[PDB]
Amino acid sequence: QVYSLIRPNENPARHFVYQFMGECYFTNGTQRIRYVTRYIYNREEYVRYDSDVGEHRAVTELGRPDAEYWNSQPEILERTRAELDTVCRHNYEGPETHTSLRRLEQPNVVISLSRTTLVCSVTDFYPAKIKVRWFRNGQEETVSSTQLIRNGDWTFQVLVMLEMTVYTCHVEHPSLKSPITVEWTG
Amino acid sequence: VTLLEQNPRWRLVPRGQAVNLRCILKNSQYPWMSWYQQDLQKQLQWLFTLRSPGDKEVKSLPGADYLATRVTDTELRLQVANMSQGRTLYCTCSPQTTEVFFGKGTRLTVVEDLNKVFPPEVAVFEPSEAEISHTQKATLVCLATGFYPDHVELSWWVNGKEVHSGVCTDPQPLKEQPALNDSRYALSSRLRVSATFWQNPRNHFRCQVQFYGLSENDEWTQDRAKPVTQIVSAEAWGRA
Amino acid sequence: GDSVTQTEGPVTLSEGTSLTVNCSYETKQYPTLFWYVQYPGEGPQLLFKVPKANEKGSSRGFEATYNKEATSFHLQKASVQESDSAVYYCALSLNSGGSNAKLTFGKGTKLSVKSHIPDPAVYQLRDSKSKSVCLFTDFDSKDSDVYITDKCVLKSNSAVAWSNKSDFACA
Amino acid sequence: DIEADHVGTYGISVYQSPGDIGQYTFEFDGDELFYVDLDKKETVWMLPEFGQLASFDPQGGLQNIAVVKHNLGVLTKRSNSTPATNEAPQATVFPKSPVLLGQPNTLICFVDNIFPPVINITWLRNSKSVADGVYETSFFVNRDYSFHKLSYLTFIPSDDDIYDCKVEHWGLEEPVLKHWTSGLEV
Ligand SMILES: *[C@@H]1O[C@H](CO)[C@@H](O)[C@H](O)[C@H]1NC(C)=O
Ligand SMILES: *[C@@H]1O[C@H](CO)[C@@H](O)[C@H](O)[C@H]1NC(C)=O
């Protein structure tokens, strides 16, 4: 519906890169929210606010004046603390409920085989939570799988390899009402 | 104290002309400077918010076209062109934690014809002898009548020093032609002193009225004097 | 955060009564609520602010509650005074949305406080003209060419009336 | 590292000097919700369907860059102008979907270890440049405060064509070229 953003605090009074990022960590939806901001100067985080600490802390010596100044101003420290509710809790319970937490893309399964063996390709799905299984008649652990591949366009793909030479690749995904089974030919 | 400085206070704007306004920041902890508009119906509306030098924003609402600029770390500009309706523009400053502080403001008056500008006539009136013998207090009354626009401000002077004890001025002027919008205005003021103070002829009372009218850049071809920015006053010595 | 609805003025109260200016906000993001007062010859100045919801801010005798349940911010004062005769504005600003230093004001509510309060006095004064100026200190016009100013608070009240017609008397 | 079910990065401000280069993005579970075009002052959603459901005031992101641009100038005048060295990026080309000849597909070039976030990525079809039908994402942040970026190329998988992903960076003495053909595995 409407997204809320984290506002970084300001400093008082040859190529360089400055980074700021505000992170919201969710566990049981909104029952456990952790809120962290990071101030980076040339690949060196120097000031970080962490909701587990409750105040700004100097990561390196360069950030001691900035952390002390921001924590000494009550109106500044209280604005940063309240961002766990005005940003993290608001975005999860609000716009993300209509967008990210609702996006579901059904996976595509192909069962082509080749060895130097019998790999199952599960492509284009969302979210990344997925379970792939091998079962000719009963599932065999044996077998290695690739890491979760992030396509970058809100889709994922994964490749599971069956080390062993009527087979079925079993896939369970939150987007599927029933698990997908494909009749492998070898 | 004052965290900002906005100039000028009043402005007479012909229809369709442009106006350039300034604002100086005096506190570094209020870097987010903004422009707010208050129309003739006293409706506040946010216009821009500039932070870094070189920012340039445009807003075009009915009555005036705006163009705000953040020149330096403390310089905030605003250009108001194609003006056909008068309004007041307030320069504001605030930290990121929203705490907006408004300046004195700049009142813009749009006139279609410059023949309606008139300077005020100032006249002081010595207090009555009945009040001196009844309340032991003397109340002088100053009066400025027949001026347009209401770009005036009154102050009392006693022996060359501006006084404020017992000084009251009308918060809003009176309309001499209440059925007209371009009506000429009138303003009064009062000064209460002790009877012994008024009975001292050594004291000099003065009522100064600063009128903001026309400049020498304006063409004037009329049979009366030019209503330019002047100071009309009137004196009255103490009587015993 | 679109609108802020305020009490339709003008509010006329006697000195010593209680003020209650209603305000109801409608927003999609967490706001910070404000109350601004503007005197007839000054600019709007901050009365008090309430950043945290379900709390109350106080300034002079004025109080307002950040009631998140009903989305209200009603201004209340126990004993009003003449010096509080001004226009009051309900305002908010989004804590995590849009531009900074951006307030959304209501239409504004005008407050006029008449004194409760005997011994009136009308005086006539003149200087170097031979019009006439009259001074009215009344606790509580139809004629032409007669201008009567609004009563100044200055407590001692005084209203100025003058006329340029010859047969004019304080009367 | 922080363990959670979801990570919402609601605000990523990156600014570089000289050049006056900025970028503001929103992330959820590592994918880009949108980026604010700092020149057009408009929000650009990666998924067009998300823009139809949610919204975001881009002026908030613009004023987010104004803060980091201010803090970077103060930090440059504090660290005695200490710049960070350039890094050599690494590219990887792989297809989005299982390759089928004749069926349209998308080629992905994953360039990692990018610092500073300034890069020149281009595609080549048979040693000839192709500029039409190419999409490029923003700079995603890494945990070591370096960056990575993905480029996309829609193509028709033929048995003959040879594709290259050319990467030019300040930390590269020579441009990096990753190859891909229709009969490869990865
Ligand atoms: C919290 O998570 C547990 C599982 O980890 C779940 O069963 C429960 O419903 C969640 N909510 C609670 C405890 O309010
Ligand atoms: C890299 O160089 C410029 C970018 O400055 C661009 O025009 C060119 O197409 C890029 N790719 C090359 C040279 O292969």
What does this structure look like?
The complex is a heterotetramer of chains A (186), B (240), C (171) and D (186). Chain B has 240 residues and is mainly beta. Chain B has two domains: 4-112, Immunoglobulin-like; 115-237, Immunoglobulin-like (Sandwich), CATH 2.60.40.10. Chain B contains two helices and 20 strands. In chain B, strands 2, 4, 5, 9, 10 and 11 form a six-stranded mixed β-sheet that branches. Chain B is globular. Chain C contains no helices and 16 strands. In chain C, the strands form four sheets. In chain C, strands 2, 5, 6, 10, 11 and 12 form a six-stranded mixed β-sheet that branches. In chain C, strands 3-9-8-7 form a four-stranded antiparallel β-sheet, with no helix packed on it. In chain C, β13 and β14 (132-136) form a beta hairpin. Chain D has two domains: 8-76, Class II Histocompatibility Antigen, M Beta Chain, Chain B, domain 1; 90-180, Immunoglobulins (Immunoglobulin-like, Sandwich). Helix content of chain D is 13%, strand content 44%. In chain D, strands 5, 6, 9, 10 and 11 form a five-stranded antiparallel β-sheet that branches. In chain D, strands 1-2-3-4 form a four-stranded antiparallel β-sheet. A four-stranded antiparallel β-sheet of chain D has the order 8-7-12-13, with no helix packed on it. The chains are: A alpha+beta (186), B mainly beta (240), C mainly beta (171), D mainly beta (186). At the A-D interface, β1, β2, α3, α4 and β6 of A face β1, β3 and α2 of D. It is classed as immune system. The entry lists the keywords peptide HLA complex, IMMUNE SYSTEM-VIRAL peptide complex, immune system. It forms a tetrameric assembly.
Features of this protein?
heterotetramer; B: 240 residues; mainly beta; Immunoglobulin-like; six-stranded mixed sheet; five-stranded antiparallel sheet; 20 strands; 5% helix; D: 186 residues; Class II Histocompatibility Antigen, M Beta Chain, Chain B, domain 1; 2 domains; four-stranded antiparallel sheet; 44% strand; globular; binds 2-acetamido-2-deoxy-beta-D-glucopyranose; transmembrane (chain A); MHC II (chain A)
